[PDB]
Design a binder for this molecule. Sequence first.
Ligand SMILES: *[C@@H]1O[C@H](CO)[C@@H](O[C@@H]2O[C@H](CO)[C@@H](O)[C@H](O)[C@H]2NC(C)=O)[C@H](O)[C@H]1NC(C)=O
Ligand SMILES: *[C@@H]1O[C@H](CO)[C@@H](O[C@@H]2O[C@H](CO)[C@@H](O)[C@H](O)[C@H]2NC(C)=O)[C@H](O)[C@H]1NC(C)=O
Ligand SMILES: *[C@@H]1O[C@H](CO)[C@@H](O[C@@H]2O[C@H](CO)[C@@H](O)[C@H](O)[C@H]2NC(C)=O)[C@H](O)[C@H]1NC(C)=O
Ligand SMILES: *[C@@H]1O[C@H](CO)[C@@H](O[C@@H]2O[C@H](CO)[C@@H](O)[C@H](O)[C@H]2NC(C)=O)[C@H](O)[C@H]1NC(C)=O
Ligand SMILES: *[C@@H]1O[C@H](CO)[C@@H](O)[C@H](O)[C@H]1NC(C)=O
Ligand SMILES: *[C@@H]1O[C@H](CO)[C@@H](O)[C@H](O)[C@H]1NC(C)=O
Ligand SMILES: [Cl-]
Lengths: 257, 253
Amino acid sequence: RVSNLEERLRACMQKLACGKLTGISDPVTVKTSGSRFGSWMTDPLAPEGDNRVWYMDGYHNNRFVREYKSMVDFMNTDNFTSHRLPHPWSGTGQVVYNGSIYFNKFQSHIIIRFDLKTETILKTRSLDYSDIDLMVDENGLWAVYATNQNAGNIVISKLDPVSLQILQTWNTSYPKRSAGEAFIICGTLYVTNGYSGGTKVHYAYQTNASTYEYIDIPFQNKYSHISMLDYNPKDRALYAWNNGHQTLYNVTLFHAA
Amino acid sequence: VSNLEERLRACMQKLACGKLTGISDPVTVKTSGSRFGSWMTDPLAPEGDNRVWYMDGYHNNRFVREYKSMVDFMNTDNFTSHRLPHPWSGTGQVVYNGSIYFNKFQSHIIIRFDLKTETILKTRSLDYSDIDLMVDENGLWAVYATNQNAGNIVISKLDPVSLQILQTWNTSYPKRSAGEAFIICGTLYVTNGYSGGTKVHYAYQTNASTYEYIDIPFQNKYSHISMLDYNPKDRALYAWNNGHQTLYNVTLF
Ligand SMILES: *[C@@H]1O[C@H](CO)[C@@H](O[C@@H]2O[C@H](CO)[C@@H](O)[C@H](O)[C@H]2NC(C)=O)[C@H](O)[C@H]1NC(C)=O
Ligand SMILES: *[C@@H]1O[C@H](CO)[C@@H](O[C@@H]2O[C@H](CO)[C@@H](O)[C@H](O)[C@H]2NC(C)=O)[C@H](O)[C@H]1NC(C)=O
Ligand SMILES: *[C@@H]1O[C@H](CO)[C@@H](O[C@@H]2O[C@H](CO)[C@@H](O)[C@H](O)[C@H]2NC(C)=O)[C@H](O)[C@H]1NC(C)=O
Ligand SMILES: *[C@@H]1O[C@H](CO)[C@@H](O[C@@H]2O[C@H](CO)[C@@H](O)[C@H](O)[C@H]2NC(C)=O)[C@H](O)[C@H]1NC(C)=O
Ligand SMILES: *[C@@H]1O[C@H](CO)[C@@H](O)[C@H](O)[C@H]1NC(C)=O
Ligand SMILES: *[C@@H]1O[C@H](CO)[C@@H](O)[C@H](O)[C@H]1NC(C)=O
Ligand SMILES: [Cl-]
């Protein structure tokens, strides 16, 4: 199938162009709307003709997902379609991946896969261990959280996007309490210092080698508070919810291994 | 489809790249030919095309043996011979994308010869086995020594169609002292000699334009090696070992 090879080729090229984070560009304010907390994103596996933006206000008591037709439509207008999820989410760490929205069920360790076209829950899984951050990079679906197994320290888990089974789990040394926002680029989890004030990326955990090291990659916090910061492997950019603002960070990568 | 299948393979191979860390014990594929020669398979060949190309001698020969597959090559002496328009020199030939790239007899002339049409597609002279052509995950290469470089090995990235020199690197390694050499993921590995206890002890990364001396031993099973080339498709070192056809498995990192 031609459509299949084009998917495998695109995925391969993204992995081939993988690097380690060295620089974060200046943010471009996409839109100014919503409350203090929230999330906005696009589907990294969406077809070329699919540039839809998915938008979710708040980190609690909300079932409604906004669907904008395009990126330009999301900037200049407010014409969107409201989707009512069967369950409200918790936190701002959900992702739209391959036509489905993956989110954390309100006040629970339960991860839900919800098909946005069929309007149907496809899978439901509890970790039994924004408390849970779901994210996607060049390698697939991820889950970032914390356990009492660790000393409250951040935990990474690779998830099968269909069965939602944990494929592999990593222990980190970074305590979630002192953790700002986080994002995974090319299998390596980057952790920021805080949510408010001046923000920098000062922690990096490579999952391929199970090693961590302390870095220092500054990026201006254009506004007071950052409630979401997620990486999109297709755009090679950082999606951010910045205190009622939707901002985009360009990203540069340098590496060979 | 067929184009995407090849673009996917080219991408997957590049993704699995890494610097050489090990060379396994060789496997004797066949015992034939004179003391010098070269044998290979087209890295950009379809899955149904497992043909083995065979070139006996290093001086004034113009006949290439074509075996239908690895099986027919290993277990049979049934082959069809191709007559090249010009004799080659040395054992630094490569069969790339249906064409044989060889150095014209006693010259700096590289000839691209399509084996199906039996025609010469391109002919180019360089500035200067004197010229060794090889293929890795990145395409076609030319390795030799120049006059500007103090007899040191010189790498040139070639355009497989126009035989144009895209980029040139000058190593710090004298070709006279050099044994056989091969390119893996844009890095020239140079052996210590053709005979005795052989080992890879020089690696030049063309990407960073840097070099480092190493120590990667491998079994020179039949004492003398006149050909040693890397094939990015099956990730193995092809070798003409003193009238013997051998294969080395390679581990990267
Ligand atoms: C994303 O989801 C699509 C389906 O929406 C997957 O497409 C399937 O691809 C396989 C072969 O790769 C086919 O056998 C299936 O029939 C396809 N599904 C459908 C419904 O046609 C695609 O593989 C998914 N991609 C990832 C990375 O999970
Ligand atoms: C993450 O860390 C916890 C604790 O640091 C690990 O749990 C330990 O597991 C070992 C055997 O694997 C036991 O001997 C210890 O008694 C456990 N300690 C605790 C406090 O539970 C856990 O296995 C680690 N997981 C991963 C994936 O690294
Ligand atoms: C190997 O040879 C084939 C055949 O000539 C090349 O295929 C050509 O690909 C280009 C674009 O990639 C097309 O425009 C041509 O029509 C193709 N040729 C034919 C005959 O269909 C292929 O590109 C070559 N590969 C390399 C690496 O040189
Ligand atoms: C290089 O390694 C490959 C894989 O280990 C070898 O291919 C295997 O050959 C054995 C026979 O001893 C088979 O049982 C395996 O099934 C083969 N593997 C595959 C993936 O088909 C290959 O023979 C080795 N070649 C050399 C020259 O060492
Ligand atoms: C990122 O850089 C690209 C290339 O110049 C540009 O097209 C794009 O608008 C930039 N995006 C941001 C958010 O700066
Ligand atoms: C070595 O290569 C560099 C890079 O192109 C070039 O400037 C220099 O002249 C070369 N030296 C010799 C001796 O070839
Ligand atoms: Cl990767």
